[PDB]
Design a protein around this ligand. Structure first.
Ligand SMILES: CCOP(=O)(Cc1csc(NC(=O)c2cc(Oc3ccc(S(C)(=O)=O)cc3)cc(O[C@@H](C)COC)c2)n1)OCC
Ligand SMILES: OC[C@H]1O[C@H](O)[C@H](O)[C@@H](O)[C@@H]1O
Ligand code: NA
Length: 441
C-alpha cells in the first residue's frame, strides 16, 4: 500500500463503527425528546407543531419562501383529484445582507417578494405564506418560532432569541408595498417530507443533504414530552447536525475535522454536519491534499497560493472530480485553474482523496438515518417507510446516493425503505403546510 492510501484509509468506517454511531444517535434522540434531558441534549428533537392528518387542504394560491442559504427562493403554489402547480424565482443574497442585521436580511427578502409579485402580476394580492426557515428554531406554534442559533455560516445580528415570523412580518410592513398572511414556518426537512407525502402517503421522514445536513420524522405525541398530548403524531426536527456537540463523535474525528471546525463561523457546533454537509466537503478535501503536499506525496510537495486559501477547493469540484470518465481531463482542468501543474498520478490521488471524504459523508449520514428508521420500527412494532430527500450533495454528487442507499439498507435489516428525490420540496412543502393550516385560520 502507498503512503497516500495509508493516509486516505483514516476516512474508512467499519460496519461496527457505523452501528456504534447509529446507537448513539438513537440515545441522543431519546435525550432531546425527554423534558429532563432536553436542555442538555446535543440533538434537540424540536417539535414542529405539524401534526398527522388525512384531510385535504384548502384550494388556492399559496406563497412560499425558502431561506436556508445564499440562494433564496420565492414560490407560488397553486392547489386545486388534487393538482399542485408551482412558479418560482431564485435570488442571491449579497454578503452585506447576510452579515449585517436581521432587519437588513428581512428587508432584502421582502424586496425579492415584491419583485416576484411584480413579475407574476400579483402585487395587489394578499396571499397566505409558508416560510421554510432552515435553521434551529423553538416553535410555540406552526406560525411562531424563536431562532435558537444560526448555522451554515449565517450571522445576521438581532435574530437569535427573536420570533422569526415577527422579523418577516416587520420587514413586510416597513416596505408597505404588498400584504401577506404568514400562516406557517417550517424547517426544510419538514417541507421536504410534506412535499414528498403529497406523492407518497408512506412518507413520514424528511432528510436534507445539501449545504447542511438534517432530518425530521413523524413522532408519536406521547414521546414528544415538550408538547402536551398523546393522541396522533407530530413532526420532529431532530437538528441532528449538532450530534457530536457533546463529544459523541470524538473517537471518529480526524485532524481535518478539527481544523474545519476551528476556522468555521460556529466552532464546536454542528460537528456531525461538518462531516457531511456541502458547506464543508470541499474544505475537508483541501485540507487532505495540503497534508499530502506537506508530506511530499502530492504535486512534488509544492502547492499554489490558491490551494493554500480556505475555500479554494469548492464542493462542486469534489462532485466534478468524481464525475471524471478516467482520462483525468476534468481533474486536470480543476487543478490547472487552481494554479497547479499536476501529473497523471497527482490527478488520481485527488480523485481518491475526494472519494474518501464523500464515502465517509455517505456512511456517517446512513448511520444517522438508520438510527431514525430503526427507532420508528420499534415505536410502530417489516417496516415499510418512504424518506423524502433534498439537497445538492444527495441529488448531484456522483455515487453519494448509491453509497448512502447501500449503507442505510445494511443498517436497517427489517425495513423496506423508499427514497423520493424531492425536486422543489424545500419550498413546495411550506405552501402545503400553509394550505392545511388555513383550514382553521
Ligand atoms: C391549524 C391546524 O392545527 P394542527 O393541530 C397543526 C398542523 C397544521 S398543518 C398540519 N399538518 C399538515 O399540514 C400536514 C400536511 C401533509 O401534507 C399534505 C396534506 C394534504 C395535501 S393535499 C393532497 O393537497 O390534500 C398535500 C400535502 C401531511 C401531514 O401529515 C402526514 C405526514 C402524516 O399524516 C398522515 C400533515 N398540522 O392541525 C392538525 C391537522
Ligand atoms: O439545511 C439543512 C439543515 O442545515 C442545518 O443543519 C440547520 O441547522 C437545519 O435547520 C437545516 O435543516
Ligand atoms: Na406529548
Amino acid at each position: 500500500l502507498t503512503l497516500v492510501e495509508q493516509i486516505l484509509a483514516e476516512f474508512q468506517l467499519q460496519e461496527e463503527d457505523l452501528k456504534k454511531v447509529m446507537r448513539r444517535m438513537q440515545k441522543e434522540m431519546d435525550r432531546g425528546l425527554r423534558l429532563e434531558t432536553h436542555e442538555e441534549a446535543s440533538v434537540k428533537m424540536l417539535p414542529t407543531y405539524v401534526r398527522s392528518t388525512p384531510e385535504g387542504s384548502e384550494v388556492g394560491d399559496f406563497l412560499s419562501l425558502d431561506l436556508g442559504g445564499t440562494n433564496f427562493r420565492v414560490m407560488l403554489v397553486k392547489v386545486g383529484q388534487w393538482s399542485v402547480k408551482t412558479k418560482h424565482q431564485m435570488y442571491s443574497i449579497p454578503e452585506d445582507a447576510m452579515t449585517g442585521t436581521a432587519e437588513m436580511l428581512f428587508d432584502y427578502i421582502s424586496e425579492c417578494i415584491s419583485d416576484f409579485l411584480d413579475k407574476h402580476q400579483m402585487k395587489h394580492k394578499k396571499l397566505p405564506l409558508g416560510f421554510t426557515f432552515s435553521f434551529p428554531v423553538r416553535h410555540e406554534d406552526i406560525d411562531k418560532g424563536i431562532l435558537l442559533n444560526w448555522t451554515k455560516g449565517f450571522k445576521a445580528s438581532g435574530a437569535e432569541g427573536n420570533n422569526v415570523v415577527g422579523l418577516l412580518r416587520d420587514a413586510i410592513k416597513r416596505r408597505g408595498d404588498f400584504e401577506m398572511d404568514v400562516v406557517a414556518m417550517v424547517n426544510d426537512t419538514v417541507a421536504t417530507m410534506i412535499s414528498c407525502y403529497y406523492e407518497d402517503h408512506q412518507c413520514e421522514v424528511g432528510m436534507i443533504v445539501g449545504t447542511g445536513c438534517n432530518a425530521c420524522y413523524m413522532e408519536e405525541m406521547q414521546n414528544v414530552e415538550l408538547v402536551e398530548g398523546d393522541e396522533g403524531r407530530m413532526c420532529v426536527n431532530t437538528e441532528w447536525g449538532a450530534f457530536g456537540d457533546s463529544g459523541e463523535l470524538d473517537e471518529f474525528l480526524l485532524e481535518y475535522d478539527r481544523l474545519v471546525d476551528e476556522s468555521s463561523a460556529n466552532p464546536g457546533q454542528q460537528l456531525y454536519e461538518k462531516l457531511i454537509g456541502g458547506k464543508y466537503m470541499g474544505e475537508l478535501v483541501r485540507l487532505v491534499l495540503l497534508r499530502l503536499v506537506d508530506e511530499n506525496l502530492l504535486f512534488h510537495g509544492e502547492a499554489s497560493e490558491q490551494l493554500r486559501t480556505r475555500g479554494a477547493f469548492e464542493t462542486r469540484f469534489v462532485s466534478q472530480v468524481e464525475s471524471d470518465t478516467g482520462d483525468r481531463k476534468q481533474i486536470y482542468n480543476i487543478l490547472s485553474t487552481l494554479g497547479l501543474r499536476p501529473s497523471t498520478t497527482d490527478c488520481d490521488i485527488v480523485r481518491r482523496a475526494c472519494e474518501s471524504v464523500s464515502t465517509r459523508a455517505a456512511h456517517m449520514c446512513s448511520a444517522g438515518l438508520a438510527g431514525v428508521i430503526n427507532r420508528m420500527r420499534e415505536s410502530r412494532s417489516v417496516m415499510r417507510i418512504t424518506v423524502g430527500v433534498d439537497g445538492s450533495v444527495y441529488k448531484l454528487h456522483p455515487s453519494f446516493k448509491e453509497r448512502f442507499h447501500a449503507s442505510v439498507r445494511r443498517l436497517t435489516p427489517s425495513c423496506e425503505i423508499t427514497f423520493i428525490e424531492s425536486e422543489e420540496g424545500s419550498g413546495r412543502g411550506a405552501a402545503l403546510v400553509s394550505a392545511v393550516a388555513c383550514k382553521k385560520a
